[PDB]
């Protein structure tokens, strides 16, 4: 699956507790669809907890490029009733868990 370079959250470029160089979500991103599913709203990104404050990454040593690259990942991630694991960090925390996205139920 694919969708179109759309970006609906805002990200800022930091420094954390650890220092990893990462970028912190503001908005919502969990709460758009289009592509392979079409229904942008609040509904599964709830079932992981997905919310405003902690950051995103989706890579190996808690570091990310910015929306661009997360526009990507996103799309590409974007499936029916697909659920991967991510990696998340809270102020330079180390946590991970496994949400699942619904484009299409």
Do not use: K, W
């Not at 370079?5 to 919502?28: H, K, M």
């Not at 079409?38 to 599964?44: C, E, N, R, S, W």
């Not at 910015?66 to 974007?78: G, I």
């Not at 659920?83 to 991970?96: K, Q, T």
Request: with cysteine; aromatic share 8%; charged share 15%.
């Amino acid at each position: 699956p694919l969708t179109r370079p759309y970006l609906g959250f805002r990200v800022a470029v930091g420094r954390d507790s650890s220092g990893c160089t990462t970028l912190s979500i503001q908005e919502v991103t969990q709460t758009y669809t289009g592509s392979n599913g079409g229904a942008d709203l609040m509904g599964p990104a709830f079932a992981a907890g997905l919310r405003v404050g902690d950051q995103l990454v989706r890579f190996a040593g808690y570091t990310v490029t910015e929306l661009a690259a997360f526009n990507t990942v996103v799309a590409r991630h974007v499936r029916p009733s697909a659920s991967i694991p991510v990696v998340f960090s809270r102020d330079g925390v180390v946590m991970s868990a496994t949400i699942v996205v619904g484009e299409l139920e």
